[PDB]
Amino acid sequence: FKCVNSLKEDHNQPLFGVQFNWHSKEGDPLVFATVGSNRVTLYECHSQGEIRLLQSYVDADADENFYTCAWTYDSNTSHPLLAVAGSRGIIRIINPITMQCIKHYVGHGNAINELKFHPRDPNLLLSVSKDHALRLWNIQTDTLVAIFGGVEGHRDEVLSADYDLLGEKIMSCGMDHSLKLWRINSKRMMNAIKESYDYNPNKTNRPFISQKIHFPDFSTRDIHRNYVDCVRWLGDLILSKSCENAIVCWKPGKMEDDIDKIKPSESNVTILGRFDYSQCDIWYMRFSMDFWQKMLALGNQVGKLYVWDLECTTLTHHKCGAAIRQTSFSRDSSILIAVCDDASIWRWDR
Ligand SMILES: CS(=O)(=O)c1ccc(-c2cnc(NCc3cccc4c3CCO4)n3cnnc23)cc1
């Protein structure tokens, strides 16, 4: 990778999220979203390293802080949609063409730390909150499918979550140091999803009744010793990090144990590998994989970008000194975008 461009956003506030749109066809505009302060900004990637500003959403609340964003598409028209959330704990669905707010979801009792769309169902949106729970929403019928948390759920703020390849299971992590598994391919969850598609408040006077899931399908506190702020599936394996200068590759149970055979009482974990680095000992720093899960990227607190080939390389620029909070690869992995604490955006091309 070579650094081809850089720009600064006028708000001069930290940028906490960056996401390229992976739902666009080949030869169509290369677009990414950045989130920081009360703003959501769209950019187009052109030839010769040109970054063109498309649109900006400025929230009506000046005190709102966006912490996360996720792309989806309307199942009926295949048109892109963008979900954003932060400190207010309100989910907002944006139309990227008009950059106007379509609908909004209220429910979480505190800030939203991450949003993730289901890999097979574009209508299924997952949120992770400071209130200690995870929520599953159906954005087509505007229903809360389930709440993941309670008695045997997270005991402190949830910082990250990820669906597996097919969206049969979720792995969540947080300030309680634990990594918790939640199966969504159970009869209870499959039926709750099916029923959320049959709901309409116009044909009934009774509300939709969400599943209150109190118990996870696996739980460990043996991987990290501080806040677990990023988690991602890599096949049946897990990649997770704390603020202890390492990304750990692990799996529940023993070496030969199948993930779908793991019982909720499983006391063992297997460490498979460790991705070691420096100067990334602060809270709230994400790692990211490309679409094909062939590349891994992580920014550090002094502006350096680490890139590993999963099949280390350091990327540095003398004008890049601020913490890189998140990174995003373009669908084809030809471009890598980095966002910083000083409101700066950095473009690296292969
Ligand atoms: C520069 S400063 O003023 O000291 C500062 C720094 C960080 C935050 C902050 C950021 N992000 C989140 N949540 C999303 C999140 C969660 C896990 C990993 C992760 C992210 C975003 C990147 O990596 N926050 C929740 N409460 N505070 C925050 C606020 C102020």
Q: 38 with 64: CB under 8 angstroms?
A: yes
Sign of CA dihedral 230, 233, 234, 240: positive
Contact assessment for residue 124 and residue 137, using Cβ atoms and an 8 Å cutoff = yes
- 3-state secondary structure at position 49: helix
CA nearest 241: which of 290, 293, 276? 276
**Number of folded domains in the chain?**
1
**Contact present, 74 and 121 (Cβ < 8 Å):** no
Written as one string, the DSSP assignment of 130-170 is TTS-EEEEETTTTEEEEEE-SSSS-SS-EEEEEE-TTSSEE
**Domain hosting residue 294, numbered range:** 1-350
At 102, list the tokens. 């379509």
Residue 315, CB-side half-sphere exposure with 13 Å CA sphere: 21
DSSP state of 29: -
Q: Which long-range contacts (CB under 8 A, 24 or more apart) does 39-47 make?
A: 39/9, 39/11, 39/66, 40/66, 40/69, 40/82, 40/84, 40/94, 40/99, 41/9, 42/96, 42/99, 43/345, 45/330, 45/335, 45/347
Q: Of 116, 123, 5, which Cα lies nearest the Cα of 53?
A: 5
Atom of ligand 1 nearest to the CA of 160: 17
8 Å CB contact between 242 and 224: yes
Ligand 1 pocket member 113 (CB < 6 A): yes
Kindly give the distance from the C-alpha atom of residue 66 to the centroid of ligand 1, in angstroms, as a whole number.
9
**Residue at 257: amino acid letter:** D
Q: Identify whether the C-beta of residue 222 lies closer than 8 Å to the C-beta of residue 252.
A: no
Q: Does the beta carbon of 232 sit less than 6 angstroms from any atom of ligand 1?
A: no
Cα 282 from Cα 266, distance rounded (Å): 31
The helix/strand/coil state of 293 is coil
Structure resolution in Å? 2.4
191's CB contacts (< 8 A; 6+ apart) are: none
Cα separation, 157 vs 164, in Å, equals: 22
**Which protein residue has the closest C-alpha to ligand 1 atom 8?**
284
How many whole angstroms from 10 Cα to the centroid of ligand 1? 20
Q: What are phi and psi of 145, to 5 degrees?
A: -70, -50
